[PDB]
């Protein structure tokens, strides 16, 4: 369902007409889905060489339309309570340090590099704080 929008070529810079099977998760992310690594594995593990053609990937997406589409339905309200845990004065803000803590120390533990990449364009105020509702909105924008 989610269109390629010429993204496949960025994953295949070596003119193979195919991309690494291990790149499938990131490809799915690039076109608009938000799969867990587990979902990616279930999709592949279900004729699938070390690579996949665009047509093979499109076939996989059509078969898994509902499950992939289900990864794009998150709402801001799903995450506010989690941030409120780190909101000392109930100001709607969290320190950049606490955000890193949340993301690298809890849940699936993102890497410090992933958090660096995430925060590259995130506004941090003069108190080292981030408006988390605005942050969530940015992360969830399609």
């Amino acid at each position: 369902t989610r269109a390629n929008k010429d993204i496949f070529t960025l994953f295949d810079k070596k003119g193979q007409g195919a991309i690494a099977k291990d790149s499938l998760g990131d490809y799915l992310r690039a076109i608009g889905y938000n799969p867990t690594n587990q979902l990616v594995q279930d999709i592949i593990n279900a004729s699938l060489a070390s690579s996949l053609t665009l047509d093979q990937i499109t076939g996989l997406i059509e078969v898994n339309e509902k499950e992939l589409d289900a990864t794009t339905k998150a709402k801001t309200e799903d995450f506010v309570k989690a941030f409120q845990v780190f909101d000392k004065e109930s100001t709607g803000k969290v320190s950049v340090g606490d955000l890193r803590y949340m993301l690298t120390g809890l849940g699936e533990k993102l890497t410090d590099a992933e958090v660096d990449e995430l925060l590259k364009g995130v506004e941090v105020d003069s108190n080292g704080e981030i408006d988390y509702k605005k942050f969530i909105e940015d992360v969830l924008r399609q």
């Binding site: 938000n34 993301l103 992360v139």
Partner: peptide
């Protein structure tokens, strides 16, 4: 609970990171 909420957010963050990267590329 927070663990579940954070995991769900992390999946979306991974999505966001890749989409920003593709834009930058």
């Amino acid at each position: 609970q927070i663990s579940q909420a954070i995991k769900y957010l992390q999946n979306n963050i991974k999505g966001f990171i890749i989409r920003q990267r593709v834009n930058d590329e």
